[PDB]
Amino acid sequence: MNISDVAKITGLTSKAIRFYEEKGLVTPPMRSENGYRTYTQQHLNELTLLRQARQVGFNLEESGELVNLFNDPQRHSADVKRRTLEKVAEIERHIEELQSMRDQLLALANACPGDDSADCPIIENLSGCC
Amino acid sequence: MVEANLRLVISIAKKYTNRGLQFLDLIQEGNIGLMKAVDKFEYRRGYKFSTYATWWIRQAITRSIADQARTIRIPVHMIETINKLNRISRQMLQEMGREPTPEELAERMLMPEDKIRKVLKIAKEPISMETPIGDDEDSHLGDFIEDTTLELPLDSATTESLRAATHDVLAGLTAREAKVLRMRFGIDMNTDYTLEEVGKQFDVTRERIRQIEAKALRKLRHPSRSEVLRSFLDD
Amino acid sequence: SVITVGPYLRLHQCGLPKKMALELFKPFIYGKLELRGLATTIKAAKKMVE
DNA sequence: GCCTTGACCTTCCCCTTGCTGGAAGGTTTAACCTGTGTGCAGTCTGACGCGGCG
DNA sequence: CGCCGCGTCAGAGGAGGTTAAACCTTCCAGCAAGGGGAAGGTCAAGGC
Ligand SMILES: [Cu+2]
């Protein structure tokens, strides 16, 4: 196809698309005699998957595995759901440690007077002084 | 078809002959213009050949005028930026009764002052060495410049006397140490060598070598030998 | 420079301002200063001239 | 003064994510359109050469 | 043939003006947030 048309359909740009391509994460679209990256429908929907996978959170490598499954007709939906729930687990732990963060942040905040003073307890307790 | 339509070429060209380059080379470029225009002409569009050909010609000459016409190759996009910019500033000095300020026409041109300023730093042409700075033919400009690159004789004598002083100081110290320093620092040879190279040429030592050149400084700091080189502290 | 008249002279002679000949005969001076040992080297000699 | 001996600093280069921005460089548009010049330069001028022309 | 005509050569800094865009391609710089490792020195401390 033409390239901008495909990237405005899918929202990407030729630069990001070419990054993904150099990562070997989709079908390589052929060129033309002139050199335009010859896209297709296969490239279109492979790109759509490679886009939405990192949105889900499957990384470059893992989204590439989703793609090579998208090429594979044998693909194990079983595996796919293991990958799914594994990433669910990482996102859970991410949430939990961020909750620990915000908890300690608010513990430090609410103790601070916020009375435009230089004697901020947060500052001095973040350093191992006194 | 070529011979049919040459007067078209001179017409276009002498519209474009605003005094950038010269007539004939522009005209010849119009001729290659016309050649490739005819080379791929659909005739069942019904239109007249003239216009199709014409804009291909325009592209040929407006490209070549860009590629050439300067000692300094400025690629095309800078050129068209300049052209755009000047078209703008004409309007700005209609309306303000004044030349414009970079900030003003830049923010109208939707880009920050740095690029504008650099474009302006870059734009002007060279200045013809043989121009007569003399009001009459008493002087050309090529007379009143200097070779600020070459040498200076006093400096050559300076370096030579410094070198004499240096190896005079060397010969006062031990042979091995002075020689090891010559290769360490490349005196009286082509090259330079370092801790491990010079060492393992001599022998393996590393840290006591450092301390050896240190005590060399100690024997050299020595306020009897500096004074032949105290002058070169200014050096 | 400009000329003027020396009437008390002997015609095998000429007038001369100092600083002209001073800068003209400069490296001569540098050399024999090194020779006498006042200025050890060239930079010092040049400073003493200045 | 010869060997280290171990442990420590500093600097440079390279390497991992997920792209983004910018430079430098290329190829096609269908209403049309056909012969400069464009401001010079004010003519110095006497001998000596040389080319056509008698 | 001897003009008549033409040609070549002699003798204080400082610049100025306009005439495309829309689609493509490669490749280098750059971020947060550092981490690894070369390669040379450099702090103490030895053994003759
Ligand atoms: Cu506080």
What is the per-residue DSSP string for B101-148? PHHHHHHHHTS-HHHHHHHHHHH-----TT---SSSTT--GGGS---T
A120 is in an annotated binding site: yes
B228 touches chain C (CB under 8 A): yes
Q: What CA–CA distance (Å, rounded) separates B152 from B156?
A: 6
Name, in order, each residue with C-beta under 8 angstroms of B109's C-beta and a sequence gap of 6 or more. Answer: B84, B85, B88, B116
CB atoms within 10 A of CB B109: 16
Q: What CA–CA distance (Å, rounded) separates A121 from A113?
A: 8
Please check whether residue B30 is in contact with residue B13, taking contact to mean a CB–CB distance below 8 angstroms.
yes
Q: Give me the residue from B154, B227, B228 closest to C42, CB to CB.
A: B154
DSSP A38: B
Quote the minimal CA–CA distance from B227 to chain C in Å. 9
| Interfacial residues of C (vs B; Cβ cutoff 8 Å) | 40-44, 46
Please check whether residue B29 is in contact with residue B60, taking contact to mean a CB–CB distance below 8 angstroms.
yes
Q: What CA–CA distance (Å, rounded) separates A63 from A50?
A: 6
Name, in order, each residue with C-beta under 8 angstroms of C6's C-beta and a sequence gap of 6 or more. Answer: C13, C14, C15
Helices (H), A31-113: 41-56, 60-71, 77-111
- C26, C40, C48: which to substitute to probe chain B, counting the most B Cβ within 10 Å? C40
Please check whether residue A54 is in contact with residue A63, taking contact to mean a CB–CB distance below 8 angstroms.
yes
Distances from the Cα of B17 to the Cα of A41, A45, B65, B109, angstroms: 51, 53, 10, 28
Q: Which two tokens stand for residue B59?
A: 């592209």
To one decimal, the resolution in angstroms is 3.9
Q: Is C46 exposed, middle or buried (0-12, 13-18, 19+ CB in 10 A)?
A: middle
Q: Which two tokens stand for residue A6?
A: 């495909």
Name, in order, each residue with C-beta under 8 angstroms of B199's C-beta and a sequence gap of 6 or more. Answer: B205, B206, B209
Tally of structural domains, chain A = 1
Quote the minimal CA–CA distance from B165 to chain C in Å. 10
B231 touches chain C (CB under 8 A): yes
Q: What CA–CA distance (Å, rounded) separates A101 from A88?
A: 20
Does nucleic acid strand E have an atom less than 7 angstroms from the CB of B135? Answer: yes
Q: Residue A38 forms beta bridges with which residues?
A: A30
- Per the structure, the complete domain to which residue A41 belongs is given by 1-130
Residue B187 main-chain phi, psi, to 5 deg: -70, 140
Q: Which two tokens stand for residue A24?
A: 């070997």
| Distance from residue B138's CA to nucleotide E5's C1', rounded to whole Å | 38
Q: What technique was this entry resolved by?
A: cryo-EM
Chain D bases closer than 7 angstroms to a protein Cβ? 1-7, 17-25, 27-37
**Cβ separation of B158 and C40 shorter than 8 Å?**
no
Q: For A4-27, give one letter per residue: b (16+ CB within 10 A) or e.
A: eebbeebebeeeebeebbeeebbb
Distance C17 CA to ligand 1 centre (A): 80
Please check whether residue A29 is in contact with residue A60, taking contact to mean a CB–CB distance below 8 angstroms.
no
Please check whether residue A23 is in contact with residue A60, taking contact to mean a CB–CB distance below 8 angstroms.
yes
DSSP B231: G
CB atoms within 10 A of CB B212: 14
Q: Chain centroid to CA B105: how far?
A: 29
Nearest in space to B166 (alpha carbons), one of C28, C30, C41, C36: C41
**Cβ separation of B158 and C44 shorter than 8 Å?**
no
Q: Give me the residue from B227, B228, B234 closest to C43, CB to CB.
A: B234
Which residue in chain C has the smallest CA separation from B159?
C42
| Distance from residue B74's CA to nucleotide E13's C1', rounded to whole Å | 29
Q: What CA–CA distance (Å, rounded) separates A2 from B191?
A: 59
Task: Indicate contact of C with B: 3+ CB pairs under 8 A.
Answer: yes
Q: Is B32 exposed, middle or buried (0-12, 13-18, 19+ CB in 10 A)?
A: middle
Nearest in space to C26 (alpha carbons), one of C11, C48, C2: C48
Q: Residue A30 forms beta bridges with which residues?
A: A38
